[PDB]
């Protein structure tokens, strides 16, 4: 029943022609609401969910300024990282970071995150106390020392308890019909004979929101963890997700197998068999 505002930020040194030096996407839960980027120093912003049409013009003007400022600061951060890691000039490197706040059903704050990565690996993380940091190496330990000597987490908490809460509250109100919901999965088993003579049973789940789901196959009394093929949960493109899991089974044994579906929109696990 909790809800989160999350931003996924990426900064690239030496992107390709036409490719962003800085891009960030913002989500509430599993619904994207905007894109921001900067290409050759030009900032651009696009809405992605319907409630964003209710934002006023100063939201987008303040956001444009924030994009310019963050893009310059991230570029400068990339240059310092290059030097502290004694890396060569001329290559392209990647700095990513995630910013989030989370509230419960009474709209009370539960937590928040700030975490950064260099070239695809953890670099520094804010701990759940929202006051201290965890580093991975001696360069990120310099960062930790600077942030703690400066008290920088204070300004992050000011962002969490100010603008993060402000926007999460307003987006949940204006986007209530999209965001305060759980669509349950529509489930079924499909059956595909194989040329060898055995059968693929493929348990499908479609139309569900949010994305988190579990699909499991089980036999009369045998464990199938190592036997089933599971696909990564995937967007259908209209706001809902889909997934499947399959096992290959001998012909004539199909009713021995049951597929179980677990999802927030269900009160108990769905249990499906073929046919």
């Amino acid at each position: 029943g909790s809800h989160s505002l999350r931003y996924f930020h990426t900064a690239v040194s030496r992107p390709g022609r036409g490719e962003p030096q800085y891009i960030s996407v913002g989500y509430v839960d599993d619904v994207q609401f905007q894109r921001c980027d900067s290409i050759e120093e030009i900032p651009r912003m696009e809405p992605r969910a319907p409630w964003m049409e209710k934002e006023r013009p100063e939201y987008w003007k303040e956001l444009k300024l924030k994009v310019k400022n963050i893009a310059q600061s991230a570029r400068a951060n990339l240059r310092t990282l290059l030097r502290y890691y004694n890396q060569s000039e001329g290559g392209s490197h990647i700095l990513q970071w995630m910013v989030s706040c989370e509230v419960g059903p009474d709209m009370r704050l539960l937590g928040a995150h700030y975490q950064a990565a260099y070239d695809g690996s953890d670099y520094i993380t804010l701990n759940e106390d929202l006051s201290s940091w965890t580093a991975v190496d001696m360069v990120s330990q310099i960062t930790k020392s600077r942030l703690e000597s400066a008290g920088t987490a204070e300004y992050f908490r000011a962002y969490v308890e100010g603008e993060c809460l402000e926007l999460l509250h307003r987006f949940l109100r204006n986007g209530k019909e999209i965001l305060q919901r759980a669509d349950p999965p529509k489930a079924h088993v499909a059956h595909h004979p194989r040329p060898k003579g055995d059968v693929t049973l493929r348990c499908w789940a479609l139309g569900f929101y949010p994305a988190d789901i579990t699909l499991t196959w089980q036999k009369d009394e045998e464990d199938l963890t190592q036997d089933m093929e599971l696909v990564e949960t995937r967007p259908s493109g209209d706001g809902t997700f889909q997934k499947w899991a399959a096992v290959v089974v001998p012909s004539g044994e199909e009713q021995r197998y049951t597929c179980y579906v677990h999802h927030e929109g269900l009160t108990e696990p769905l249990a499906l068999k073929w046919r």
Partner: peptide
């Protein structure tokens, strides 16, 4: 929409 300069 927040960034911390790490160095």
């Amino acid at each position: 929409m927040f960034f911390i300069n790490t160095l």
